[PDB]
Design a binder for these strands. Structure first.
Lengths: 219, 82, 135, 61, 100, 24
RNA sequence: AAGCUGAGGCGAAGGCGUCUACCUAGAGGGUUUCUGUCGAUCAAGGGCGAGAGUAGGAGUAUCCAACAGGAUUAGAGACCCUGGUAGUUCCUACCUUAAACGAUGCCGACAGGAGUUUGUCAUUUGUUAAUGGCAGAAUCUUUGGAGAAAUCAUAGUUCUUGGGCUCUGGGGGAAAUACGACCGCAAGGCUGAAACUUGAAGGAAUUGACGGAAGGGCACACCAGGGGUGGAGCCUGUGGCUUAAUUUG
């Protein structure tokens, strides 16, 4: 009934590992064919907390496409998101919400679309309940959110990016600038969708620690 | 005190607080400032509100610059009352 | 027979509890997307149609899966909650939270519970009309 | 198979016709846990109730 | 005569406003005219202590669902979100909670 | 309902139009 | 185009919510700029005008008048359910109506406090703030006056009756009618009688009674039960039929 389906381990660090993540099951390779003719671009979806066994950053989510392998499936950056609980929690009333979608190429061969959400803050001297950013002072922030995010993405390679999303380095570099204009509390980087992934080259196998068993098959 | 207000001879506060036109004699709140960049020693007249950004004869940068109301005094620059 | 476990390892899966009025789904599957045993209130869950969605019948279906899971045998399954679709904007029913709790006391290890309800951004018309349903 | 609760506290009464009580119970099995179950008759605190099914709490309050 | 100065509408200065739907009737109603921001726990309360035995990851924070709810007058009255009240305390524009 | 009464006359008129043209 | 989204902003009203570049209009503020009464309101006349509707192309996902089944009901042409074409979207011509509602025409002056809030300026280092100015937007109140009352900072300054212009009503039906005209592809719009007919038709608020309205209480009202009645024979009471009378409530 279930018998003869061949289970395989899942496996690039990067941020953490604890390289093995989970076991995924497909089917027997029945000749005339490769292992990679199954497990065809399956995405997976994992918190940062799954591999390090730590709370904190539990909410952030990572995803990896099934780029290559047969003995043991190796994988590649698909993107990021939040848990829907966390994203929903951030929104508040009586505050100017601010977005900034950015199409941005990396230093290496990805193309990404990053997003963000940032709110204004009341502080100390203002007694009124609602503080709303001006259209101009909202459009000032979108320039700061784009320029910081697009420059920091463009300069560094993608392992540094995926480390910095855990470390919230780009978050803090925004609030630097805003102090001058609008304080802006909150600020999370929400999503990054991968538009154009690198195709499986033999140089990329040498980068991501993919074994000889894989590149014998899928090339 | 709705009934009694003395309106022939009001206070010095109340003339400043009321509108430009609403005063007992209507007359404006805007005067010709003398100015000086510490670079030069030439003493330049200007209209406080303006429209036009103000230069001295000698330098190049505007002495004052235009907003809605009063002139925005760029740099360290000063006013001699005359 | 399945996992071919290493020695001292834990195998994890997924729940996909689709809870909606009239039915409940406990369609467990691998992270990649290969479906293991599922079941639901309507099928092996009961009879009637009266009592498809009711939280006894969800609790019965969520033991019937976890009979199999130990057998397969997985270990723990991540739980994602699906309520109902976009136009209706409906979040999960009561039959969710009894189905989840039957997996716990089955018992099966769990972790990372999420609400993955497909909500729109504006988008489309509901049933009924202007006045809508009036009963 | 035939498990044995005991009534900690009577919260109140319920049903359409006021026919039934409902009660916080701590299991006498000794596994431990608290179950909120609807009993039929009349119940003095500390009474022991035999339940065919230990699972499912009643509904709401 | 006029029951309310408002007319049951909270809109001043604008001719038109967007529509939403009561969750139950599914009825189209203007946005200006019975909203609740609604935080409920995703597991429950009595379910939660049974769960936290079987949790991978220690301690953990079991998440909350959030929902902005739109009703309509007919739907709101039937569910006892709102009720009618006396002509004098109609004016009372604050909710039930009170603080010092 | 006045709306309907209005609808009824609209109809009533459209008929007298018809009959009348029978005879133009 | 969710959430942000509010008795918040803009627009002559209808109306207008992702982001980017593009052409375009203007209100408010500030102004020791310029002109010098150029203005107010309006029959005709001219444009803009929700949604439905019409004509011809381009689309056709969702939802859906009609229609088709399925339930429910005495019947159900409906409410509930499953499908569904016209429409719903874009472009070119039309139509010109809505509870198009602040059911409150437009311009002008004055008359009371209170704190909100949007834009912008002014004097202060309380600078995403404090106090004050004009212009908006609402609100509160033990204030005055008005009103039939509900209520209203305008619906006040009105038998203590006159700042300036425009349109409308003259008990209720008959009548969003008839006839005639003009506009319209058509659906219709607009202007608008009489014969006859009637003693009320309406407005606000009070007291009851009522609600398949809500919230408080209660009782054989139900719950849990106990014993009966309704069936059988007989005793009695009452309707029917019978009778000279079957006295009567």
């Amino acid at each position: 009934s279930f018998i003869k389906k061949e289970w395989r381990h899942v496996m690039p660090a990067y941020f953490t590992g604890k390289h093995d993540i989970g076991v995924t099951v497909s089917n027997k390779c029945a000749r005339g064919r490769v292992p990679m003719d199954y497990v065809n671009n399956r995405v997976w979806e994992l918190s940062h907390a799954d591999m390090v066994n730590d709370l904190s950053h539990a909410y952030r989510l990572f995803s990896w496409r099934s780029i290559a392998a047969g003995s043991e499936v190796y994988t590649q950056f698909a993107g990021m998101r939040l848990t829907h609980d966390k994203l929903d929690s951030i929104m508040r009333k009586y505050r100017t919400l601010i977005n900034a979608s950015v199409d941005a190429k990396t230093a290496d061969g990805f193309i990404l679309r990053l997003f963000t959400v940032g709110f204004t803050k009341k502080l100390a001297n203002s007694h009124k309940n609602h503080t709303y950013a001006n259209s101009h002072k909202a459009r000032q922030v979108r320039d700061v959110m784009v320029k910081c995010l697009t420059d920091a993405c463009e300069s560094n390679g993608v392992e540094q990016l995926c480390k910095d999303f855990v470390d919230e380095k780009i978050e803090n570099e925004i609030v630097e600038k805003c102090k001058q204009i609008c304080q802006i509390e909150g600020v999370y980087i929400t999503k990054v969708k991968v538009i154009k992934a690198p195709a499986l080259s033999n140089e990329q196998v040498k980068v991501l620690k993919i074994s000889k068993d894989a590149a014998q098959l899928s090339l | 005190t709705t009934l009694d207000v003395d309106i022939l001879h009001p206070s010095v506060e109340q003339e400043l607080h009321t509108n430009k036109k609403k005063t007992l004699v209507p007359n404006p709140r805007s005067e010709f400032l003398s100015l000086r960049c510490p670079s030069c020693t030439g003493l330049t007249t200007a209209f406080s509100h303006s429209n036009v950004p103000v230069f001295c004869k000698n330098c190049q940068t505007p002495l004052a610059t235009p907003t809605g109301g009063r002139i925005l005094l760029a740099d360290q620059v000063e006013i001699r009352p005359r | 027979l399945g996992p071919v476990k290493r020695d001292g390892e834990i195998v994890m899966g997924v729940a996909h509890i689709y809870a909606s009025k009239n039915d409940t789904f406990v369609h467990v599957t691998d992270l990649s997307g290969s479906e293991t045993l599922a079941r639901c209130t309507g099928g092996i869950a009961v009879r009637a149609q009266r009592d498809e969605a009711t939280p006894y019948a969800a609790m019965l279906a969520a033991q019937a899966v976890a009979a199999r899971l130990k057998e397969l045998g997985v270990d723990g399954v991540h739980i994602k909650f699906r309520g109902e679709g976009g136009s209706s904007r409906r979040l999960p029913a009561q039959g969710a939270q009894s189905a989840l709790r039957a997996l716990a006391r089955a018992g099966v290890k769990i972790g990372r519970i999420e609400d993955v309800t497909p909500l729109p951004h504006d988008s489309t018309r509901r049933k009924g009309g202007r006045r809508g349903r009036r009963l | 198979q035939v498990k044995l609760a005991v009534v900690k506290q009577v919260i109140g009464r319920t049903g359409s016709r006021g026919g039934v009580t409902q009660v916080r119970v701590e299991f006498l099995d000794d596994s431990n846990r608290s179950l909120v179950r609807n009993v039929k008759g009349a119940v003095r605190e500390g009474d022991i109730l035999s339940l065919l099914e230990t699972e499912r709490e009643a509904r709401r309050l | 005569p006029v029951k309310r100065r408002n007319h049951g509408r909270s809109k001043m200065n604008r001719g038109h406003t967007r529509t939403v739907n009561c969750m139950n009737c599914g009825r189209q109603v203007p946005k200006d005219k019975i909203t609740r921001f609604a935080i409920k726990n995703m597991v429950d309360a009595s379910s939660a202590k049974d769960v936290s035995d079987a949790c991978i990851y220690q301690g953990y924070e079991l998440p909350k669902t959030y929902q902005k709810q739109y009703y309509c007058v007919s739907c709101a009255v039937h569910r006892h979100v709102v009720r009618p009240r006396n002509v004098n305390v109609r004016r009372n524009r604050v909710p039930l909670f009170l603080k010092l | 309902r006045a709306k309907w009464r209005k609808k009824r006359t609209r109809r009533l008129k459209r008929k007298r139009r018809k009959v009348r043209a029978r005879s133009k």
